[PDB]
From TrEMBL:
Originating species: Legionella pneumophila subsp. pneumophila (strain Philadelphia 1 / ATCC 33152 / DSM 7513)
UniProt-recorded name of the protein: Uncharacterized protein
Superkingdom as given in the UniProt entry: Bacteria
Lineage: Bacteria, Pseudomonadati, Pseudomonadota, Gammaproteobacteria, Legionellales
Residue span, Lpg1496-like N-terminal domain: 1-132
Length: 132
C-alpha cells in the first residue's frame, strides 16, 4: 500500500510526496501511472524520490496543467489533466472523500485543510482489511 502522503515544498513550489511499503510497489505504481498518463496524452509530473517514494511536482499552467498547486482558499490541489487519470490514481493512493473534495467529472481534487493543513503535513492510510 501507499503508507502515507506528505505535502512538501521544493524550490518554493508544492509537491506531494508518496511513500510505499516497498520499492517493488513504488516501481509498479510509477510504471502503471506513467503508462496511463501516456495513453491519455498527458505529461504527468510524477518523479522518483527514493527507493520507496515518489513526488508529484507542481503544475505549470498553461503549458502543462498537471500537478500540484495551492488553491486561492489555501488547499493543496492536484490537477490530473483528465478525469480518467484521477480515477486511476486515487484508489491506488487510498485517497477518498474523507481526505479530499473529489468531483465525478473533473480532473482536479482539493485536500481538506483539516487533513493536510500545510507544508510537511502527513496523511496516513488504513490498510483495507486490517484486524483491530
Amino acid at each position: 500500500m501507499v503508507t502515507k502522503i506528505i505535502w512538501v515544498s521544493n524550490n518554493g513550489k508544492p509537491n506531494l510526496k508518496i511513500e510505499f511499503v516497498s520499492e517493488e510497489e513504488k516501481s509498479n505504481f510509477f510504471k502503471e501511472v506513467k503508462k496511463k498518463a501516456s495513453e491519455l496524452g498527458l505529461n504527468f509530473p510524477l518523479v522518483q524520490g527514493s527507493g520507496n517514494s515518489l513526488l508529484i511536482e507542481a503544475s505549470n499552467y498553461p503549458i502543462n496543467p498537471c500537478g500540484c498547486y495551492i488553491s486561492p482558499g489555501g488547499k493543496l490541489a492536484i490537477n490530473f489533466g483528465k478525469v480518467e487519470l484521477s480515477h486511476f490514481i486515487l484508489p491506488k493512493v487510498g485517497v477518498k472523500t474523507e481526505h479530499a473534495e473529489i468531483f465525478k467529472d473533473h480532473n482536479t481534487i482539493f485536500f481538506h485543510k483539516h487533513k493536510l493543513p500545510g507544508v510537511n503535513s502527513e496523511l496516513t492510510f488504513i490498510p483495507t482489511g486490517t484486524p483491530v
